[PDB]
């Protein structure tokens, strides 16, 4: 019930990180896209950042709070589950040998990581209802693109922690009818 809103907020933050990445070092434009496109649509020549969902690890038992609706005398139970999702964040930017202001795709991924681990961005993301854990590795790997050249597709896993709320119903009671029996 949250991956839509989370993906929207993550897209906003990723586009902000790309706008900042345009300032320190320079690329021709950028894009931020989801890797598994639900319809047939191509990879972009421009330097882009991809993101994808990988896991979802619930953390701790669900916490159930009880809220009275006061109208129908029904205890609405609110089950909050803490969630650590894992986002595979990758980058793609072909390297031109002729140009001199070179910025490999590993560097764009590294800047995204370092931006998303700074304390100010952490506090902003906190104000946007989730947070970010540590990124412990950035894997720069080589492959062949469709032009039979060599390209790097670095990627790292970013753990994003938040809560998701479930609303259900339960019956209330305002009485105590005991039976005091004698041994």
């Amino acid at each position: 019930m949250f991956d839509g809103e989370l993906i929207a907020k993550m897209v906003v933050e990723l586009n902000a990180a790309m706008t900042s990445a345009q300032e320190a070092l320079q690329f021709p434009d950028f894009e931020v896209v989801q890797k598994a496109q639900p319809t047939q649509q191509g990879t972009s020549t421009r330097p882009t950042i991809f993101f994808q969902k990988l896991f979802d690890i619930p953390r701790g038992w669900p916490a159930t709070d009880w809220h009275l609706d006061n109208t129908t005398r029904k205890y609405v139970e609110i089950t909050r589950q803490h969630v650590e999702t894992t986002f595979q964040i990758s980058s793609l930017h072909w390297q031109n040998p002729e140009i001199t202001h070179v910025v490999t795709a590993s560097d764009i991924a590294n800047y995204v990581r370092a931006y998303f681990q700074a304390r100010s961005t952490i506090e902003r993301v906190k104000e946007l209802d989730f947070l970010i854990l540590r990124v412990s590795q950035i894997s720069n790997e080589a492959f062949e693109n469709d032009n039979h050249q060599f390209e790097f597709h670095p990627s790292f896993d970013m753990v994003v922690t938040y809560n998701q709320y479930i609303r259900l119903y339960e019956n209330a009671a305002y009485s105590a009818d005991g039976v005091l029996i004698g041994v």
Binding site: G4, V11, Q34, P38, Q40, Q41, S44, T45
Partner: protein, 132 residues
């Protein structure tokens, strides 16, 4: 010259020809959630031969699937998936198809052959026409 001219144009003289509703890619933008949304040119009728391809059912994740294929020979420039470009789309028998392979031959000869997958049922117009 034979690799010039148009071999499919003369081949259409003897064999029959189906009419498909072709539609060409125009631009493509990211909506919210970073998925791209494709948009296209105006649809237009195309004269083509749409032969079958043997489609076989398979199993994935313990379910059963099947990919529906048609091989279209058309006298037009047909482009599928490309860097910064999405594939084209044609309507036939109330079914949407998008190109998957690309037999080229256009700039050589003017015609082309493409393998196209089915996508789903067509939208039905108020008058009953099987077009979007």
């Amino acid at each position: 010259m034979i690799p010039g001219a148009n071999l499919l144009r003369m081949a259409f003289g003897v064999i029959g020809t189906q009419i498909v509703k072709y539609r060409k890619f125009e631009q493509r933008v990211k909506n919210d959630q970073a998925q791209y949304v494709s948009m296209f040119e105006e649809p237009f009728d195309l004269a083509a031969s749409v032969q079958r391809v043997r489609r076989d059912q398979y199993v994935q994740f313990n379910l059963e699937f099947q990919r529906n294929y048609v091989m279209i020979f058309a006298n037009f420039e047909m482009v599928d998936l490309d860097r910064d470009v999405a594939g084209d789309q044609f309507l036939w028998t109330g079914r949407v198809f998008q190109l998957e392979s690309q037999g080229s031959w256009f700039y050589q000869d003017g015609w082309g052959v493409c393998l196209a997958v089915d996508i789903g049922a067509a939208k039905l117009t108020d008058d009953g026409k099987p077009t979007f």
